[PDB]
Design a protein around this motif. Structure first.
Motif, mmCIF file in Angstrom:
data_model
loop_
_atom_site.group_PDB
_atom_site.id
_atom_site.type_symbol
_atom_site.label_atom_id
_atom_site.label_comp_id
_atom_site.label_asym_id
_atom_site.label_seq_id
_atom_site.Cartn_x
_atom_site.Cartn_y
_atom_site.Cartn_z
ATOM 1 N N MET B 17 0.669 -1.384 -0.102
ATOM 2 C CA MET B 17 0.017 -0.055 -0.116
ATOM 3 C C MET B 17 0.915 1.263 0.020
ATOM 4 S SD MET B 17 -2.880 -1.572 -0.290
ATOM 5 C CE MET B 17 -3.960 -0.238 0.126
ATOM 6 N N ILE B 18 0.368 2.325 -0.923
ATOM 7 C CA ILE B 18 1.109 3.447 -0.907
ATOM 8 C C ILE B 18 -0.060 4.524 -0.377
ATOM 9 C CG2 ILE B 18 2.134 5.178 -2.559
ATOM 10 C CD1 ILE B 18 2.532 2.588 -4.701
ATOM 11 N N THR B 19 0.401 5.513 0.449
ATOM 12 C CA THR B 19 -0.455 6.598 0.902
ATOM 13 C C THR B 19 -0.425 7.651 0.040
ATOM 14 O OG1 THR B 19 0.357 5.675 2.931
ATOM 15 C CG2 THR B 19 -0.797 7.654 3.154
ATOM 16 N N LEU B 20 -1.518 8.198 -0.154
ATOM 17 C CA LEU B 20 -1.791 9.460 -1.202
ATOM 18 C C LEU B 20 -2.876 10.125 -0.345
ATOM 19 C CD1 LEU B 20 -1.388 10.928 -3.857
ATOM 20 C CD2 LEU B 20 -2.963 9.447 -5.068
ATOM 21 N N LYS B 21 -2.878 11.690 -0.094
ATOM 22 C CA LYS B 21 -3.905 12.447 0.243
ATOM 23 C C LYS B 21 -4.447 12.712 -0.861
ATOM 24 C CE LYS B 21 -1.340 14.530 4.005
ATOM 25 N NZ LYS B 21 -1.389 16.053 4.500
ATOM 26 N N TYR B 22 -5.747 12.636 -0.835
ATOM 27 C CA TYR B 22 -6.634 12.290 -1.955
ATOM 28 C C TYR B 22 -7.814 13.340 -1.947
ATOM 29 C CZ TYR B 22 -10.231 10.164 -4.860
ATOM 30 O OH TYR B 22 -11.555 9.730 -5.683
ATOM 31 N N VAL B 23 -8.085 14.272 -2.786
ATOM 32 C CA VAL B 23 -9.323 15.131 -2.832
ATOM 33 C C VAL B 23 -10.497 14.194 -3.053
ATOM 34 C CG1 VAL B 23 -10.460 17.195 -3.881
ATOM 35 C CG2 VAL B 23 -7.860 16.982 -3.652
ATOM 36 N N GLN B 41 0.286 16.457 -4.162
ATOM 37 C CA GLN B 41 0.213 15.257 -3.246
ATOM 38 C C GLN B 41 0.974 14.228 -4.099
ATOM 39 O OE1 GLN B 41 -0.300 15.394 -0.504
ATOM 40 N NE2 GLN B 41 -1.153 17.655 -0.439
ATOM 41 N N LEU B 42 0.771 13.933 -5.398
ATOM 42 C CA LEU B 42 1.395 12.938 -6.059
ATOM 43 C C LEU B 42 2.879 13.225 -6.021
ATOM 44 C CD1 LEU B 42 -1.104 12.430 -8.872
ATOM 45 C CD2 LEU B 42 -0.412 10.540 -7.674
ATOM 46 N N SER B 43 3.533 14.158 -6.100
ATOM 47 C CA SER B 43 4.738 14.328 -6.067
ATOM 48 C C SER B 43 5.158 13.874 -4.835
ATOM 49 C CB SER B 43 5.208 15.969 -6.446
ATOM 50 O OG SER B 43 6.409 16.175 -6.155
ATOM 51 N N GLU B 92 -3.940 1.131 -8.355
ATOM 52 C CA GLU B 92 -4.802 2.199 -7.884
ATOM 53 C C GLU B 92 -4.245 3.689 -8.119
ATOM 54 O OE1 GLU B 92 -6.167 0.333 -4.593
ATOM 55 O OE2 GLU B 92 -8.292 0.410 -5.486
ATOM 56 N N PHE B 93 -3.085 3.562 -7.405
ATOM 57 C CA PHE B 93 -2.122 4.850 -7.294
ATOM 58 C C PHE B 93 -1.819 5.177 -8.757
ATOM 59 C CE2 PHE B 93 0.778 7.871 -5.005
ATOM 60 C CZ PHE B 93 1.628 7.958 -5.944
ATOM 61 N N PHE B 94 -1.248 4.467 -9.496
ATOM 62 C CA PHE B 94 -0.875 4.491 -10.766
ATOM 63 C C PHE B 94 -2.055 5.078 -11.468
ATOM 64 C CE2 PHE B 94 3.092 3.583 -8.987
ATOM 65 C CZ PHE B 94 3.811 4.573 -9.159
ATOM 66 N N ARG B 95 -3.123 4.669 -11.280
ATOM 67 C CA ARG B 95 -4.494 4.927 -12.062
ATOM 68 C C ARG B 95 -4.839 6.546 -11.582
ATOM 69 N NH1 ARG B 95 -7.934 1.319 -10.339
ATOM 70 N NH2 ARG B 95 -7.285 -0.132 -12.152
ATOM 71 N N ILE B 96 -4.629 6.902 -10.489
ATOM 72 C CA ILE B 96 -4.700 8.518 -9.950
ATOM 73 C C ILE B 96 -3.697 9.177 -10.564
ATOM 74 C CG2 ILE B 96 -4.953 9.926 -8.222
ATOM 75 C CD1 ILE B 96 -5.838 7.697 -6.523
ATOM 76 N N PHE B 97 -2.363 8.675 -10.547
ATOM 77 C CA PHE B 97 -1.344 9.419 -11.371
ATOM 78 C C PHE B 97 -1.678 9.551 -13.009
ATOM 79 C CE2 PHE B 97 3.312 10.542 -11.780
ATOM 80 C CZ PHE B 97 3.692 10.025 -12.947
ATOM 81 N N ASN B 98 -1.858 8.296 -13.669
ATOM 82 C CA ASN B 98 -2.054 8.582 -15.093
ATOM 83 C C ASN B 98 -3.197 9.487 -15.349
ATOM 84 O OD1 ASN B 98 0.017 7.221 -16.528
ATOM 85 N ND2 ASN B 98 -0.817 5.383 -15.304
#
Lengths: 121, 119
Positions: B17-23, B41-43, B92-98
């Motif tokens: 799991m990767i933590t991302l602060k997500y709107v 956030q992604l950076s 999932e993290f990389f779907r929000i990134f792309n």
């Protein structure tokens, strides 16, 4: 194959824990005392670890590396169930699962693979 | 550049799991509502990830992949010049990134889209 575990450790997250039913006595007891259960346990953990990755047709990927590791230790499982010396301990209580960092796990994986080379309880 | 993104996702464990602060609600809101927060956030999440991999690696390196991804998103943090943290699988993290990356190509006026509340 030692350059490949190093590249696998370098590409595994430092905080990602690998579960392993570590066999007590690895550290103090003669290899005959533990190697048989250590290779089974390592086979199961590496086999589980391979399902975590998908294949990449690039260079070495964690998938290709772990898969090759799976195949070495599964050859060692087979060999350790042939070796008919009653004595080489093959009856163990199923060890307690322990969490290890990739670096710790693979240090264990390496001592165990090498436990064969230099061959009461 | 999604070649390296799929290679990374394939070279990351499915349950790491990767933590991302997500709107909240950025899945249904116009991009203008979340895209400034999301590149930052992604950076931050990707720069943090560098800490988990080694730099010493022949060939394929997750460190070098992530590092080039840190450079693409940081370009966008500067062009652009809570949120509650959530755990994501690599995929999932990389779907929000792309999706955050694509949201600059497909850019439309803020007055011409919608407000920034879902409910």
């Amino acid at each position: 194959n030692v350059k490949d575990v190093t590249k696998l450790v370098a590409n595994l997250p430092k905080d990602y824990m690998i579960t392993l039913k570590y066999v007590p006595g690895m550290d103090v007891l003669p290899s005959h005392c533990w190697i048989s259960e250590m290779v089974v346990q390592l086979s199961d953990s590496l086999t589980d670890l391979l399902d975590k990755f998908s294949n990449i047709s690039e260079g070495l990927s964690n998938y290709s590396i772990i898969d090759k590791l799976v195949n070495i230790v599964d050859d060692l499982v087979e060999c350790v169930k042939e070796n008919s010396s009653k004595d080489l301990k093959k009856s163990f209580k199923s060890p307690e699962p322990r969490l290890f960092t990739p670096e710790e796990f693979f240090r264990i994986f390496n001592r165990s693979i090498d436990a064969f080379k230099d061959f009461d309880c």
